Amino acid sequence: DKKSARIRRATRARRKLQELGATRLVVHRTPRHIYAQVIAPNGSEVLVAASTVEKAIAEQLKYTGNKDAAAAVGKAVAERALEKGIKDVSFDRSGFQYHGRVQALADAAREAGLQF
Amino acid sequence: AKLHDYYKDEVVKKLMTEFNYNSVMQVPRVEKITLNMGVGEAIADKKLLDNAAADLAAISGQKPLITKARKSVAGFKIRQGYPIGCKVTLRGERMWEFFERLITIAVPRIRDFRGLSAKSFDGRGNYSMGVREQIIFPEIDYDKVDRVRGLDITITTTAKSDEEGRALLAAFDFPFR
Amino acid sequence: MLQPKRTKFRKMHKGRNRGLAQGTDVSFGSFGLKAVGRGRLTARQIEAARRAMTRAVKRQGKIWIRVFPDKPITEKPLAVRMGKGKGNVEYWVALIQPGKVLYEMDGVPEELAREAFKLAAAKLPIKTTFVTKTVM
Amino acid sequence: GIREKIKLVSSAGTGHFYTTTKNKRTKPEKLELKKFDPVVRQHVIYKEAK
Amino acid sequence: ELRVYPGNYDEYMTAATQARERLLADNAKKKAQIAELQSFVSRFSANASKSRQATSRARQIDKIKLEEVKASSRQ
Amino acid sequence: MKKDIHPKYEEITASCSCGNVMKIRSTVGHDLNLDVCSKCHPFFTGKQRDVATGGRVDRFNKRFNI
Amino acid sequence: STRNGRDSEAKRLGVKRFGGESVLAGSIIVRQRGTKFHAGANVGCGRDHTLFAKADGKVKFEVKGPKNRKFISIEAE
RNA sequence: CCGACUUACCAACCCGAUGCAAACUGCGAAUACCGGAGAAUGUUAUCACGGGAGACACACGGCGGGUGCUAACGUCCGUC
RNA sequence: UCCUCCUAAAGAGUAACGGAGGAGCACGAAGGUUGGCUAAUCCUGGUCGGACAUCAGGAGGUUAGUGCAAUGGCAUAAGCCAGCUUGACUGCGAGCGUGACGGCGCGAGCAGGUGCGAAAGCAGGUCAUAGUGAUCCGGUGGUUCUGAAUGGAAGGGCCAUC
RNA sequence: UGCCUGGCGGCCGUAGCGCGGUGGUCCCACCUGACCCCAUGCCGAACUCAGAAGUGAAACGCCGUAGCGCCGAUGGUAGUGUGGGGUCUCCCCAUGCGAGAGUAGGGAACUGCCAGGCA
RNA sequence: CGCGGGGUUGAGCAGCCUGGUAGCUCGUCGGGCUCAUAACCCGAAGAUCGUCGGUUCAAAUCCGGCCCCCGCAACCA
Ligand SMILES: *C(=O)[C@H](CCSC)NC=O
Ligand SMILES: [Mg+2]
Ligand SMILES: [Mg+2]
Ligand SMILES: [Mg+2]
Ligand SMILES: [Mg+2]
């Protein structure tokens, strides 16, 4: 398939981020939206969420789903978390290739003080 | 693509009317063409495989992928990794171009033509055919080549059943019986 | 003579013949020979006791053999000292436990079947008994 | 047996050699590997020579 | 290897011939005497009371060590 | 595509023996004029004239001039 | 007959500390051949697939996983 | 020519039923073993170090086995 | 002499001239890392083509595969490709396992310098278990450690190694 | 608070497969196009990018259904620790533990953290 | 079911020796020589390199199993 194929591509980088017990930032990307959340080391409960589905992030956007949309939500995730005290996370590709808007999403959060 | 426009302007409405479909996307559509040939004789001479690759590169505007044997067999004395066949996959614009330049000119040119068989579907809407003569394509001029090596055309379509595949291909005036 | 073809291993351990039996019920036919004793029963006593009961019914009726030897037994030759390997396999036996159903037949009257098994029970080392088919 | 022993001498000028095996008939090529040189305490090139 | 002889060319040819054929004859003779001294060793190295007899000459069949020949580069 | 690993591909103008001018993008390097296309192929006209081989009983009656 | 009678010295495999045993750091917990017991939390895996403690605590065997595979962990107390 | 018909035959894989296995396991005990806690009882019965040894030909009986003929006051192991 | 299975009695160990098989290697990539992929066997269609070469669809699902014998293991793949590479690295090592000993094995982490990755990280050889012999006497390179009155030297010593 | 949807887990077939029906405002999926960021040992099929016309067909999610998968008692049976016995190459008695297969039956899941649309 | 040596044309033997060319002598067949048969001269035919698998681009040849033939052994008081 297509989703079960990608969801298998992420199980190694994910199952090492669980052995290390490190808070991870996981991204889900869609041809219309891009999501990102900061998940506790338990993997069950999430501290910070920010995505283009939100009105406060999307109403400032020409079209959610391009590279500059990912930057606009990458900025949002960091600024939302830096007040919470979460600074040191580890990036989670979640199966996607680190090349496109996922790359642009990561750098925008990296440039806003987030360490990873 | 003339055939693509003809499809999206006539064949869609014809097939929905003929089959009583609910969604415009329920209609069977051709999704890919595959041209291959397993030369077989490349065991004792590799250059024949390169000649076959040149033949297919001429026939279709792409570069053939040279496919090797999946497993060793002693019937024909081959091993794993031996390059045996060549294959070309066409999708979209080039697929439509090859479809048109086959069914409008190349099919008549075959010696002693009567009509392509209609019972040659795989029971799942796909089609297959062998040409038996590479010189029926205008890209080959009977002077460069050295053999009568043939090609396999494989029409892979979205059609649910062989009946729907037959209907879709007959919509394109396929030379059936 | 019954014997397996293409056995995985050439020789088998001795092993002990404990417990009761498994094929205790006549399922194919209607009349059967049920073992009451215990002990290995070779592949010759199977044939020699089958010849005697496919001829006591002339030739009419089916017969099922519900035992197969599939157990190699080795013997040391004469005037050979002990040691220096294991013996050479000679014959094959089917271990029988009390409760097994060895033979059975159908298509014959009860009195003829009951008499036919009396001719095969005299060729087998172990004590046998006559059992019919129930509906369980 | 067929695999013959060789040694990788250091190109830092110090006398310090790693030792390893090599199949002497594939093609005779001096191995070119960057390895640690504890005398100078830095990675250098170790051209093989017995 | 490189072997050095005196001469001009004919002395070299004669020395090479009368050394190479000498070697190819001596090695054949030694191999023949190995195949002959192997007679009792492979005939009766076992059974009965003799037994130990043939072990006496099992060491003079390996105190020979046939000299290996090398195929000439000339072909 | 993959940056000049395939043959050239340019538009050509091929015509039949009765005209029927068509534009097909192929890899020839020069146009060609050929026989009947699918439009003019006699696989729907001369079918009877194709399965017609045979006849000697009538060929004897013309010989029988008496 | 003959051509037999060959064996190899036993490798002393098996579990060395069972559930509830207080193990120190770096102490071998199991000596496997393959990976019959998978390394869970706070235990490692040597090149022999030998699981050893990484932090001193109490051993705990579990059967977590999508394929019901035995996992060895440590309750570091 | 295709096989155009047939055979009282053999029939691999699948489906239903029936057995066998030390080198088979989609199941699986009793015991034994390892660790923790708790009273009783045991002249420390436990461990470490130091002085002195002897011994390394074992036998039968019970239970689990290999070999043998589920022969031997036979032979080789485990535990009492 | 060494490796794998059973006998071995559900911890470890356990014998016989008991039952079955293997080793004295291989690899400068067949190792490191990053990215990606998933098998055997069958059905229906297809020029030569055939009982099985090559192509397309379906069922199946690891019955495939693992440099090498067997057992255990492997989808997060330990299996199959490609990019860059030398961690097949030097000094150490808490703590364990197994041996009467000689010994053998697992090892988080520390220091110095690297490789891949954007990064968290991984890397002190290969899915693991065989592929091997102590001491003596010598050979080669390095090192003022010693240098039979003194300065050298010969010879020893230490490290690497045959 | 309810309904639907997306991500991340717990849990691992009572949790999966099959068959029938059903959902597009948001979400998701297909989808349009591809010069370009990137790509195929051929192919934008897959990965990627710029997008939003169209559909809910395929996939996905939900509901229903026992045809399979799966879970599975009670009773009996086998085995076995200790202590006795026999006609002792195998069983019996006291006592403790007590399966496997099979039967009646259960069964087409449960749950937590955030973020949306609707009420 | 223990040990060594062989299997190539009709007969007896090379070619295994580091895989890249199926050979020799008698024999057979068809002509010629002769009154005729031999001898002689001319030309030609055949063999899955015992059968089965494996590295090999490639095998009579290298490796392994199977079958057949030829010898030997299976002890002493
Ligand atoms: C063998 O037994 C005999 C000796 C008998 S003496 C009592 N022969 C010896 O050579
Ligand atoms: Mg002694
Ligand atoms: Mg003793
Ligand atoms: Mg003893
Ligand atoms: Mg008892």
Ligand SMILES: [Mg+2]
């Ligand atoms: Mg005794």
Ligand SMILES: [Mg+2]
């Ligand atoms: Mg044990």
Ligand SMILES: [Mg+2]
């Ligand atoms: Mg035990």
Ligand SMILES: [Mg+2]
């Ligand atoms: Mg002992």
Ligand SMILES: [Mg+2]
């Ligand atoms: Mg490997």
Ligand SMILES: [Mg+2]
């Ligand atoms: Mg990977």
Ligand SMILES: [Mg+2]
């Ligand atoms: Mg690897």
Ligand SMILES: [Mg+2]
């Ligand atoms: Mg290995």
Ligand SMILES: [Mg+2]
């Ligand atoms: Mg001095």
Ligand SMILES: [Mg+2]
């Ligand atoms: Mg002096």
Ligand SMILES: [Mg+2]
């Ligand atoms: Mg010195």
Ligand SMILES: [Mg+2]
């Ligand atoms: Mg049950």
